[PDB]
Amino acid sequence: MDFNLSNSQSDIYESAYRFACDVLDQDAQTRISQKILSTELWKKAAAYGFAHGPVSHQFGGSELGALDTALMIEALGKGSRDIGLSFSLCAHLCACVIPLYRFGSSELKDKYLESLVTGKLIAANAATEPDAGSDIYNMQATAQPCEGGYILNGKKIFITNAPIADVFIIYAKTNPDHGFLGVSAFLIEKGTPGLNVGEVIPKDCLSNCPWSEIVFNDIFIPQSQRIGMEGAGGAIFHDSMIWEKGCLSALFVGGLARLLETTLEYAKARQQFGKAIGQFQSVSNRIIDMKLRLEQCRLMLYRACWKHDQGQDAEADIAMSKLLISEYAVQSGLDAIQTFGGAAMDQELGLVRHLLNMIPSRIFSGTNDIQKEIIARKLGLRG
Amino acid sequence: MDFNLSNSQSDIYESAYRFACDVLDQDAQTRISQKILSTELWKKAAAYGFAHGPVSHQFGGSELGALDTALMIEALGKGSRDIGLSFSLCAHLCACVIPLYRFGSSELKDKYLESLVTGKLIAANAATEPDAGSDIYNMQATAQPCEGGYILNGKKIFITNAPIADVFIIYAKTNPDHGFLGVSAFLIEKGTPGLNVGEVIPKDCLSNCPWSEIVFNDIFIPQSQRIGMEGAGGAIFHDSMIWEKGCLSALFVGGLARLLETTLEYAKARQQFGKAIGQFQSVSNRIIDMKLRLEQCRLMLYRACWKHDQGQDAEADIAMSKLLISEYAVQSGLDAIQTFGGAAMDQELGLVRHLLNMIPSRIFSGTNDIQKEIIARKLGLRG
Amino acid sequence: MDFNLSNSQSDIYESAYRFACDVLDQDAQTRISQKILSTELWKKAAAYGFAHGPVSHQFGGSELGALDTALMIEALGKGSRDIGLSFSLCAHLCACVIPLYRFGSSELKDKYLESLVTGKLIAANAATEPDAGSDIYNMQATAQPCEGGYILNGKKIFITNAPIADVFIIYAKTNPDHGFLGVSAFLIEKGTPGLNVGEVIPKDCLSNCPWSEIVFNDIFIPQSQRIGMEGAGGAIFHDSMIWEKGCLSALFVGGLARLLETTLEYAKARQQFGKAIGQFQSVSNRIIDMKLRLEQCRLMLYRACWKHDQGQDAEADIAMSKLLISEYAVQSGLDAIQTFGGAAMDQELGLVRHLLNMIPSRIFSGTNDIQKEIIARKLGLRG
Amino acid sequence: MDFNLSNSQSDIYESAYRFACDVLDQDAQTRISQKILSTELWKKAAAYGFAHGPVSHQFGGSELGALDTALMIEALGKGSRDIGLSFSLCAHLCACVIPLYRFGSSELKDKYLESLVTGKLIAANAATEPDAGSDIYNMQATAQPCEGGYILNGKKIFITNAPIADVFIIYAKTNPDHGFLGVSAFLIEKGTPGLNVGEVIPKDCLSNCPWSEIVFNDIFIPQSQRIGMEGAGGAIFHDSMIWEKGCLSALFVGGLARLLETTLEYAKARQQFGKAIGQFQSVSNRIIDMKLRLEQCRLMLYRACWKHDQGQDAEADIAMSKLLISEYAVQSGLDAIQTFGGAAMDQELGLVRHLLNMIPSRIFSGTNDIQKEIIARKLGLRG
Ligand SMILES: Cc1cc2nc3c(=O)[nH]c(=O)nc-3n(C[C@H](O)[C@H](O)[C@H](O)COP(=O)(O)OP(=O)(O)OC[C@H]3O[C@@H](n4cnc5c(N)ncnc54)[C@H](O)[C@@H]3O)c2cc1C
Ligand SMILES: Cc1cc2nc3c(=O)[nH]c(=O)nc-3n(C[C@H](O)[C@H](O)[C@H](O)COP(=O)(O)OP(=O)(O)OC[C@H]3O[C@@H](n4cnc5c(N)ncnc54)[C@H](O)[C@@H]3O)c2cc1C
Ligand SMILES: Cc1cc2nc3c(=O)[nH]c(=O)nc-3n(C[C@H](O)[C@H](O)[C@H](O)COP(=O)(O)OP(=O)(O)OC[C@H]3O[C@@H](n4cnc5c(N)ncnc54)[C@H](O)[C@@H]3O)c2cc1C
Ligand SMILES: Cc1cc2nc3c(=O)[nH]c(=O)nc-3n(C[C@H](O)[C@H](O)[C@H](O)COP(=O)(O)OP(=O)(O)OC[C@H]3O[C@@H](n4cnc5c(N)ncnc54)[C@H](O)[C@@H]3O)c2cc1C
Ligand code: PRO
Ligand code: PRO
Ligand code: PRO
Ligand code: PRO
Ligand SMILES: [Cl-]
Ligand SMILES: [Cl-]
């Protein structure tokens, strides 16, 4: 039992924080106003190390553990206001880089993995369908085995980075008779015949992070582009969602640290009735809730990541962390707005935009109701 | 004890609902997308009756009571998606039309009141200052008595309708030695020398409802433009906020009725895991919370308005209603988004925009912490 | 729309309140300390009118409607501390008197109903079994038709009033192949061969209200003691639970009115740091929550009862009322204890005993999770 | 960063857990039923090590750190149902043993400290007065300096262990002109002339843990019985409350671990509607809340204690831990009762008694509103 960061960990955090503040955050307000995702800036962030995670040196990574990866991303969330860019980068890392590294063949990693790790190629993962969201393993896209590979048909929706991706990590049924066990994973390239990437679909939350639909019309997937074994795609997807839950939770912990600092400063500086508004218990009680949340969920995340690094079973701990972090991110966004009153409406301050950016955290990587189902299953409440 | 609407009340509701659906709601999505407040449409709504409230027939009103006025505005909130336009109209009614009618001299009402009632002139009320929000009676704008009237100096912020108003109902100190008892109210016209109306300041919440700052530099206010008695402006403002709390609460009750209908329909229609998502208790329990909220706060509002119509003391009931309605509007907006999952991000559906539009309800007309202070005082907890 | 009580209603309330304060409450602390249920006092309360409800004059009742019955019981809850005695009386009224009146034959009502209405005979209703609680219609007790009537076998648990009852309203399967449609209802007398009433089983909540198990070993039920039609017992039970939900909710509304008055008085009188503790927002904010709850749930209950009196469908409104009242009763009990601090531990003040008495309200007459299932079904979320 | 216990820590926990299960818990139900605090059993627990904490070997302690002390007490809370006995023991340790060890003179420690450490003498701490609870430093008891020592007059209330104590650690004003800085601490013996210990005052919460009032009528305190320096009693008391907050929080963490295990087992075993009740999301969602609480607050407590052991400032962390643990203990007690339904009323199962035992945790050692004031002050919100 020790709650100090090592010097190595402290350095990883502080280097990422400096990069987020001095490189990504500079000019962020202009990009946010114009709903711009700067792919040149994204590539600098990827190459700096945010697209590396646990990837080995062989492929350009630093062989970071889960806790180190989470610290980097916590720093990113605290230091850069451009949370849409950060979300895009973490989706690429967790849903695309990491499954390719963990399950790809030597051939497939040799062709694509270092390019994803350095951000030379941007990747999108495509699992969700119009009738398969929480019930993801009822997806109906089909990768029908054929001579030389697969014929792919289907439609995927809500695909982060699809309008800017060079490659797609896609999930489809190689055996449509089964659910989880009938899914396989594939890498396909932008521009392959039959791949139709939709136009960006705007949204108010994470508004500069592009997503769209993609449609597959008789795409030929060469055999060598299957990721992992036939029928293992359900497990690959599930594994990538454990990494995703943990890393976006880190982003929102860092965002909550930033929000708390802003909110404390305001509550000390803004006077009404001849005293700082933080002196009224209605005001200070909400700020204390924000502090309690931050301290609790940061510890849950660190323990979940450290257990993983130790080889222990950390999946329930990650589901608990994601459930807490996203709920606390939304609630604390509301509490900050209430602290500021009318001044919260100011687009330059970004407090309403911050709440909008947190609203999808309770949906992404499995909704929080699904996290409860995962925890219930680990607790033995599901048969 | 009776919980049925009279035929008269039912007709008032249904006529307002038809007008909101068939006139205001038609083309609303385009106006909302472009952040347009259509002053021609606003004037049609005002003349239809939304700018009338309790005003007598002498000045073009229908002599509606508080409950009738609330029913009209509940219908407006349920029937039109253009909540920014509705908010603008209700601010004009409650913070400008009603204090002029209730406290204005015969001369001042004869010159201006029917024009406000028919929407020929648009009005903004200006009380809030950079250092006087919740502590509103510490405002520092000064209306220094002089030969012929007053010299007005000061700055007002967060003024709904200021970029489109023809007249301003302004509050300023005629005796800066006192707080509540040193305030007087005045009507001034757009274009009077020394009145500088700021450019619209954008916001994400209620985004097509314009507001800005206004600055007074040595404005001369003629004596006849004081509203009510010298030093009575604190009481006039407070009275107008009771009307405002009740009428915007009605708007958000109607909006919650609309949101609940949309959310129930989706939860019955959207299937995952082979059944409607409403069949999972995590989903249905939130929808039931939305229903419970709607039924409770509608009854609180109706009772508060009816007590007022009966001549009973209704101020605590109105503060309770406003506190409940705005909290429940925000919470139910969050619950609807969680019901829809990824589909909530769709700008055409408007669920995130709905939540944004509800966020200021807990600040406007006195924050909900201030409502608690009002209720605490009525309960005898403030000395 | 009217929120005043009629003179008739006001008189019913005030007469019941006087009886609760001047007759039942006098000496209550001694009975509560000794865990005594005074059957002589219970009979006085029954004869005064608390055992009458909607029963016609023909059988000794006053033909009160649901709202009048609820007002009487609200007064009882506000005026007498002996909530265990009040609960016992209301269980007799709602689960035994009312189904006999509503479904009994002329013969059976002529023999027993006036005696129950005047409290000459005390009744217990017995539906719950060790394996049938929320799933009540899976009860396994069997009333096997035979020449002359039925042979009854089975075991019932959690039976309020069983150690003091003269008659039992019991539910059992006349067709064990079905659930809801296989249940019938019967009246049986204390002392009939094969009826074994268990010894009182102590509890900390409602601690002077006796309950126990009862066992049926080859009881012969004469044909004339069936209540209503063969196979209608599921519907009779369900109907009696609608009356029960509404009347115990009234008791706890009255108890919350009493608790709020006590808590407000203390928060004004108790000083720390040189001021009344109600002046700290942490303290006043909880008291305001208690007030908000009381006003909201009282209105929901009154509307539910009035809709029933009007002939409208009131079952969802009653389920909503019961769910709100019992949750708010428990939460406000907790808030009162927090207001008083160390002084809450005083057995003479009864605040901890009050919380204990409210804890079962969320279980009784169908748990609050089951109320949500009922409301979900009314909302169309259950297929 | 490490979240494993050392072998030493694991052994401390497991030895305390065995002692709580095999010695204290055996026969607990009889003692609880009879409201017995067994002083022979208490002395065995004290001598086993629960009265040692950080005390040095010189005085019979083991020189445990805060985290080790907390682990021992977590084990005690999980392993023994007799929480009243455990509370009594921890009050003796934290409010009496620890301030004597930390501030007593060599002479005073030599005379009394080892006897307290081995439980040969039982101690009560007496700070609270009828008009000084949260405002503790406005206490009015006076220790007026005189030749040879002090003359003590005053009244103390809510004194845990007073009916069974051999010695009293008492706080009184040596300079009544000041608050915090006018308090001194003293040790006095049972039986000294002018000390009147009141009869035990019963309570439903922690019902076998005795407390009473004590009155001082012209007690002579010899000079050598002052604990620490003149005027340092406010600081000694405050320091002892930091130890108390942490150690009773540990007791309630262990109690929550026990409650969760019981509740999970029931939710898997109890069937309704043909499935385990844990399969309904209304049921499993509350159990998941209990799990989330336990994991979060255990980590907060461990970090607070470890920071103290490291020499870092841990007072805010302890206030946060106490606030979380006591709130979560109460809420999870409510959630367990709701899980069990009617079966929660069983006195043998102890679930209602468990909730009663947790209710005072939010009051003791400074109410949770006062904890928020402490945290607000650490956050810079109090001037
Ligand atoms: C910001 C964002 C980025 C995204 N990026 C990607 C991406 O890059 N690639 C990709 O493939 N997908 C992506 N998604 C989609 C995401 O995977 C789905 O939105 C998510 O899994 C939820 O599915 P759904 O939207 O269809 O909601 P539904 O599954 O329809 O859920 C609707 C409601 O039903 C509840 N519900 C459903 N099942 C249950 C159940 N068994 N028990 C209790 N409640 C239940 C849900 O919790 C929710 O409250 C993204 C989503 C978001 C919000
Ligand atoms: C949509 C919108 C439209 C508006 N339109 C108008 C208009 O047309 N005309 C006009 O004059 N103004 C208008 N206002 C301004 C509104 O009156 C103020 O925003 C409101 O009174 C709150 O003041 P403030 O923003 O300065 O917040 P502050 O008063 O600075 O409040 C900051 C925080 O401190 C809390 N706080 C302050 N005092 C206390 C206290 N005693 N006890 C406990 N907590 C306290 C507040 O509740 C809040 O949480 C509008 C505001 C909004 C959001
Ligand atoms: C004070 C008191 C007086 C009583 N008096 C009587 C009396 O006089 N006569 C009589 O016959 N009975 C009486 N009862 C029993 C009462 O009817 C049952 O306790 C009640 O119906 C709950 O059943 P149970 O205790 O078996 O809980 P269970 O049904 O075992 O419930 C355990 C948990 O599972 C939840 N649960 C069960 N099903 C679902 C579901 N489909 N969905 C979601 N959650 C679910 C429950 O809400 C609860 O949280 C009394 C009970 C009490 C507390
Ligand atoms: C189980 C138990 C064991 C105890 N054992 C001992 C013992 O052994 N020795 C001893 O000396 N005392 C003991 N106490 C007393 C304990 O110290 C006091 O009960 C506690 O400090 C609260 O004081 P009070 O009861 O007078 O509540 P009050 O201070 O009257 O509090 C009443 C309410 O006012 C709130 N309040 C007060 N001040 C503020 C404020 N500034 N801001 C916001 N809210 C405020 C409180 O939070 C509470 O909600 C014990 C108490 C308990 C419950
Ligand atoms: O297995 C999981 O973790 C995925 C996430 C979205 C639906 N279920
Ligand atoms: O008196 C009121 O109602 C006003 C509203 C804003 C500040 N206080
Ligand atoms: O139908 C009802 O209302 C009953 C109440 C207990 C179980 N279900
Ligand atoms: O200083 C503290 O920690 C004490 C605890 C009770 C009142 N204040
Ligand atoms: Cl305060
Ligand atoms: Cl469910």
Side-chain angles (χ1 to χ4, degrees), chain A residues 1 4 278 284 295-296 303 328 382, chain D residues 1 4 278 284 295-296 303 328 382:
Chain A
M1 198 114 263
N4 280 329
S284 60
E295 298 309 320
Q296 287 173 104
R303 185 174 72 176
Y328 291 171
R382 296 290 177 264
Chain D
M1 198 114 263
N4 280 329
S284 60
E295 298 309 320
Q296 287 173 104
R303 185 174 72 176
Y328 291 171
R382 296 290 177 264

PDB file of all heavy atoms in Angstrom, chain A residues 1 4 278 284 295-296 303 328 382, chain D residues 1 4 278 284 295-296 303 328 382:
ATOM      1  N   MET A   1       0.792  -1.234   0.000  1.00  0.00           N
ATOM      2  CA  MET A   1       0.000   0.000   0.000  1.00  0.00           C
ATOM      3  C   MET A   1       0.820   1.279   0.000  1.00  0.00           C
ATOM      4  O   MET A   1       1.479   1.561   0.994  1.00  0.00           O
ATOM      5  CB  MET A   1      -0.898  -0.015   1.209  1.00  0.00           C
ATOM      6  CG  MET A   1      -2.046   0.956   1.121  1.00  0.00           C
ATOM      7  SD  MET A   1      -3.502  -0.058   1.051  1.00  0.00           S
ATOM      8  CE  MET A   1      -3.685  -0.031  -0.630  1.00  0.00           C
ATOM      9  N   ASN A   4       1.886   7.238  -3.584  1.00  0.00           N
ATOM     10  CA  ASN A   4       2.775   8.160  -4.281  1.00  0.00           C
ATOM     11  C   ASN A   4       3.055   7.627  -5.678  1.00  0.00           C
ATOM     12  O   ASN A   4       3.102   6.416  -5.915  1.00  0.00           O
ATOM     13  CB  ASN A   4       4.131   8.326  -3.564  1.00  0.00           C
ATOM     14  CG  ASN A   4       4.103   9.292  -2.357  1.00  0.00           C
ATOM     15  OD1 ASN A   4       3.325  10.279  -2.295  1.00  0.00           O
ATOM     16  ND2 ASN A   4       5.003   9.005  -1.380  1.00  0.00           N
ATOM     17  N   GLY A 278     -18.413  31.211  -2.077  1.00  0.00           N
ATOM     18  CA  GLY A 278     -18.061  29.912  -1.462  1.00  0.00           C
ATOM     19  C   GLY A 278     -18.365  29.843   0.028  1.00  0.00           C
ATOM     20  O   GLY A 278     -18.379  28.737   0.595  1.00  0.00           O
ATOM     21  N   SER A 284     -20.703  25.906  -1.204  1.00  0.00           N
ATOM     22  CA  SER A 284     -19.543  25.090  -0.845  1.00  0.00           C
ATOM     23  C   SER A 284     -19.918  23.617  -0.819  1.00  0.00           C
ATOM     24  O   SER A 284     -19.072  22.780  -1.163  1.00  0.00           O
ATOM     25  CB  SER A 284     -18.938  25.525   0.511  1.00  0.00           C
ATOM     26  OG  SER A 284     -19.910  25.405   1.574  1.00  0.00           O
ATOM     27  N   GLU A 295     -11.490  12.690  -5.905  1.00  0.00           N
ATOM     28  CA  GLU A 295     -10.526  11.891  -5.144  1.00  0.00           C
ATOM     29  C   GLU A 295     -10.892  10.412  -5.196  1.00  0.00           C
ATOM     30  O   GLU A 295     -10.008   9.536  -5.396  1.00  0.00           O
ATOM     31  CB  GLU A 295     -10.491  12.370  -3.700  1.00  0.00           C
ATOM     32  CG  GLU A 295     -10.025  13.859  -3.527  1.00  0.00           C
ATOM     33  CD  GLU A 295      -8.704  14.142  -4.254  1.00  0.00           C
ATOM     34  OE1 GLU A 295      -7.802  13.278  -4.223  1.00  0.00           O
ATOM     35  OE2 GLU A 295      -8.565  15.221  -4.894  1.00  0.00           O
ATOM     36  N   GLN A 296     -12.193  10.126  -5.061  1.00  0.00           N
ATOM     37  CA  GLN A 296     -12.644   8.730  -5.095  1.00  0.00           C
ATOM     38  C   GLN A 296     -12.393   8.078  -6.452  1.00  0.00           C
ATOM     39  O   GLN A 296     -11.874   6.954  -6.529  1.00  0.00           O
ATOM     40  CB  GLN A 296     -14.132   8.608  -4.814  1.00  0.00           C
ATOM     41  CG  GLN A 296     -14.476   8.862  -3.318  1.00  0.00           C
ATOM     42  CD  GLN A 296     -15.956   8.885  -3.156  1.00  0.00           C
ATOM     43  OE1 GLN A 296     -16.531   7.928  -2.659  1.00  0.00           O
ATOM     44  NE2 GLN A 296     -16.599   9.993  -3.550  1.00  0.00           N
ATOM     45  N   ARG A 303      -6.237   2.141  -9.097  1.00  0.00           N
ATOM     46  CA  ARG A 303      -6.200   0.758  -8.638  1.00  0.00           C
ATOM     47  C   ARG A 303      -6.536  -0.200  -9.776  1.00  0.00           C
ATOM     48  O   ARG A 303      -5.874  -1.247  -9.915  1.00  0.00           O
ATOM     49  CB  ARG A 303      -7.121   0.527  -7.439  1.00  0.00           C
ATOM     50  CG  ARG A 303      -6.901  -0.935  -6.945  1.00  0.00           C
ATOM     51  CD  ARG A 303      -7.658  -1.189  -5.693  1.00  0.00           C
ATOM     52  NE  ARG A 303      -9.095  -1.272  -6.016  1.00  0.00           N
ATOM     53  CZ  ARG A 303     -10.009  -1.581  -5.094  1.00  0.00           C
ATOM     54  NH1 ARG A 303      -9.589  -1.817  -3.859  1.00  0.00           N
ATOM     55  NH2 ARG A 303     -11.321  -1.626  -5.369  1.00  0.00           N
ATOM     56  N   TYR A 328     -19.651  11.009 -12.408  1.00  0.00           N
ATOM     57  CA  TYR A 328     -19.103  12.136 -11.669  1.00  0.00           C
ATOM     58  C   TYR A 328     -18.693  13.282 -12.597  1.00  0.00           C
ATOM     59  O   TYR A 328     -18.838  14.444 -12.208  1.00  0.00           O
ATOM     60  CB  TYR A 328     -17.890  11.708 -10.860  1.00  0.00           C
ATOM     61  CG  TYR A 328     -18.141  10.789  -9.706  1.00  0.00           C
ATOM     62  CD1 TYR A 328     -17.034  10.209  -9.043  1.00  0.00           C
ATOM     63  CD2 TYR A 328     -19.421  10.540  -9.268  1.00  0.00           C
ATOM     64  CE1 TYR A 328     -17.241   9.375  -7.905  1.00  0.00           C
ATOM     65  CE2 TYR A 328     -19.635   9.686  -8.182  1.00  0.00           C
ATOM     66  CZ  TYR A 328     -18.539   9.152  -7.528  1.00  0.00           C
ATOM     67  OH  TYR A 328     -18.802   8.309  -6.430  1.00  0.00           O
ATOM     68  N   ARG A 382     -25.909 -12.723 -12.169  1.00  0.00           N
ATOM     69  CA  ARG A 382     -26.495 -13.035 -13.474  1.00  0.00           C
ATOM     70  C   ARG A 382     -26.428 -14.548 -13.761  1.00  0.00           C
ATOM     71  O   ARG A 382     -26.084 -14.974 -14.869  1.00  0.00           O
ATOM     72  CB  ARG A 382     -25.843 -12.231 -14.599  1.00  0.00           C
ATOM     73  CG  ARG A 382     -26.059 -10.683 -14.482  1.00  0.00           C
ATOM     74  CD  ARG A 382     -27.535 -10.366 -14.767  1.00  0.00           C
ATOM     75  NE  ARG A 382     -27.848  -8.963 -14.623  1.00  0.00           N
ATOM     76  CZ  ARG A 382     -28.370  -8.445 -13.506  1.00  0.00           C
ATOM     77  NH1 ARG A 382     -28.513  -9.189 -12.428  1.00  0.00           N
ATOM     78  NH2 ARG A 382     -28.706  -7.152 -13.455  1.00  0.00           N
TER      79      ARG A 382
ATOM     80  N   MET D   1       2.860   3.907  -6.034  1.00  0.00           N
ATOM     81  CA  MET D   1       1.501   3.374  -6.174  1.00  0.00           C
ATOM     82  C   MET D   1       1.408   1.858  -6.126  1.00  0.00           C
ATOM     83  O   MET D   1       1.886   1.205  -7.046  1.00  0.00           O
ATOM     84  CB  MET D   1       0.932   3.866  -7.478  1.00  0.00           C
ATOM     85  CG  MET D   1      -0.568   3.759  -7.562  1.00  0.00           C
ATOM     86  SD  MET D   1      -1.147   5.435  -7.625  1.00  0.00           S
ATOM     87  CE  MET D   1      -1.506   5.586  -5.980  1.00  0.00           C
ATOM     88  N   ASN D   4      -1.656  -3.450  -2.673  1.00  0.00           N
ATOM     89  CA  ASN D   4      -1.567  -4.691  -1.912  1.00  0.00           C
ATOM     90  C   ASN D   4      -1.193  -4.371  -0.472  1.00  0.00           C
ATOM     91  O   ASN D   4      -0.473  -3.410  -0.185  1.00  0.00           O
ATOM     92  CB  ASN D   4      -0.493  -5.648  -2.470  1.00  0.00           C
ATOM     93  CG  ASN D   4      -0.942  -6.460  -3.709  1.00  0.00           C
ATOM     94  OD1 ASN D   4      -2.137  -6.803  -3.900  1.00  0.00           O
ATOM     95  ND2 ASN D   4       0.062  -6.793  -4.562  1.00  0.00           N
ATOM     96  N   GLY D 278     -31.811 -10.982  -7.463  1.00  0.00           N
ATOM     97  CA  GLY D 278     -30.695 -10.162  -7.983  1.00  0.00           C
ATOM     98  C   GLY D 278     -30.723  -9.984  -9.495  1.00  0.00           C
ATOM     99  O   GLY D 278     -30.019  -9.104 -10.016  1.00  0.00           O
ATOM    100  N   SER D 284     -30.430  -5.381  -8.395  1.00  0.00           N
ATOM    101  CA  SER D 284     -28.980  -5.415  -8.584  1.00  0.00           C
ATOM    102  C   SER D 284     -28.413  -4.005  -8.598  1.00  0.00           C
ATOM    103  O   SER D 284     -27.284  -3.811  -8.125  1.00  0.00           O
ATOM    104  CB  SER D 284     -28.591  -6.175  -9.876  1.00  0.00           C
ATOM    105  OG  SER D 284     -29.175  -5.547 -11.040  1.00  0.00           O
ATOM    106  N   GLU D 295     -15.844   0.080  -2.146  1.00  0.00           N
ATOM    107  CA  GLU D 295     -14.514   0.131  -2.758  1.00  0.00           C
ATOM    108  C   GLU D 295     -13.945   1.545  -2.692  1.00  0.00           C
ATOM    109  O   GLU D 295     -12.746   1.741  -2.357  1.00  0.00           O
ATOM    110  CB  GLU D 295     -14.598  -0.332  -4.205  1.00  0.00           C
ATOM    111  CG  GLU D 295     -15.078  -1.816  -4.378  1.00  0.00           C
ATOM    112  CD  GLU D 295     -14.271  -2.793  -3.513  1.00  0.00           C
ATOM    113  OE1 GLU D 295     -13.038  -2.625  -3.405  1.00  0.00           O
ATOM    114  OE2 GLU D 295     -14.867  -3.722  -2.902  1.00  0.00           O
ATOM    115  N   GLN D 296     -14.803   2.534  -2.968  1.00  0.00           N
ATOM    116  CA  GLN D 296     -14.349   3.929  -2.934  1.00  0.00           C
ATOM    117  C   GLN D 296     -13.924   4.361  -1.533  1.00  0.00           C
ATOM    118  O   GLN D 296     -12.858   4.968  -1.352  1.00  0.00           O
ATOM    119  CB  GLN D 296     -15.436   4.890  -3.382  1.00  0.00           C
ATOM    120  CG  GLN D 296     -15.686   4.830  -4.917  1.00  0.00           C
ATOM    121  CD  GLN D 296     -16.866   5.674  -5.251  1.00  0.00           C
ATOM    122  OE1 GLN D 296     -16.707   6.766  -5.776  1.00  0.00           O
ATOM    123  NE2 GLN D 296     -18.077   5.170  -4.978  1.00  0.00           N
ATOM    124  N   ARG D 303      -5.819   5.651   2.041  1.00  0.00           N
ATOM    125  CA  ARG D 303      -4.924   6.729   1.643  1.00  0.00           C
ATOM    126  C   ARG D 303      -4.764   7.745   2.769  1.00  0.00           C
ATOM    127  O   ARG D 303      -3.635   8.209   3.025  1.00  0.00           O
ATOM    128  CB  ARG D 303      -5.385   7.411   0.354  1.00  0.00           C
ATOM    129  CG  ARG D 303      -4.293   8.446  -0.055  1.00  0.00           C
ATOM    130  CD  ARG D 303      -4.603   9.047  -1.377  1.00  0.00           C
ATOM    131  NE  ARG D 303      -5.744   9.970  -1.221  1.00  0.00           N
ATOM    132  CZ  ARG D 303      -6.187  10.721  -2.231  1.00  0.00           C
ATOM    133  NH1 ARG D 303      -5.567  10.618  -3.399  1.00  0.00           N
ATOM    134  NH2 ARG D 303      -7.243  11.538  -2.110  1.00  0.00           N
ATOM    135  N   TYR D 328     -22.157   6.478   3.415  1.00  0.00           N
ATOM    136  CA  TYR D 328     -22.293   5.216   2.703  1.00  0.00           C
ATOM    137  C   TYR D 328     -22.746   4.084   3.628  1.00  0.00           C
ATOM    138  O   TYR D 328     -23.498   3.215   3.181  1.00  0.00           O
ATOM    139  CB  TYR D 328     -20.976   4.820   2.059  1.00  0.00           C
ATOM    140  CG  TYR D 328     -20.502   5.665   0.920  1.00  0.00           C
ATOM    141  CD1 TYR D 328     -19.197   5.460   0.413  1.00  0.00           C
ATOM    142  CD2 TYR D 328     -21.330   6.602   0.344  1.00  0.00           C
ATOM    143  CE1 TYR D 328     -18.740   6.213  -0.708  1.00  0.00           C
ATOM    144  CE2 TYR D 328     -20.873   7.377  -0.726  1.00  0.00           C
ATOM    145  CZ  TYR D 328     -19.605   7.140  -1.226  1.00  0.00           C
ATOM    146  OH  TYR D 328     -19.192   7.934  -2.314  1.00  0.00           O
ATOM    147  N   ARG D 382     -13.214  29.334   3.351  1.00  0.00           N
ATOM    148  CA  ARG D 382     -13.654  29.981   4.590  1.00  0.00           C
ATOM    149  C   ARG D 382     -12.746  31.176   4.940  1.00  0.00           C
ATOM    150  O   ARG D 382     -12.350  31.361   6.096  1.00  0.00           O
ATOM    151  CB  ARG D 382     -13.735  28.991   5.751  1.00  0.00           C
ATOM    152  CG  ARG D 382     -14.803  27.861   5.551  1.00  0.00           C
ATOM    153  CD  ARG D 382     -16.205  28.482   5.649  1.00  0.00           C
ATOM    154  NE  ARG D 382     -17.262  27.525   5.416  1.00  0.00           N
ATOM    155  CZ  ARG D 382     -17.853  27.370   4.226  1.00  0.00           C
ATOM    156  NH1 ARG D 382     -17.405  28.015   3.168  1.00  0.00           N
ATOM    157  NH2 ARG D 382     -18.876  26.520   4.086  1.00  0.00           N
TER     158      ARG D 382
END
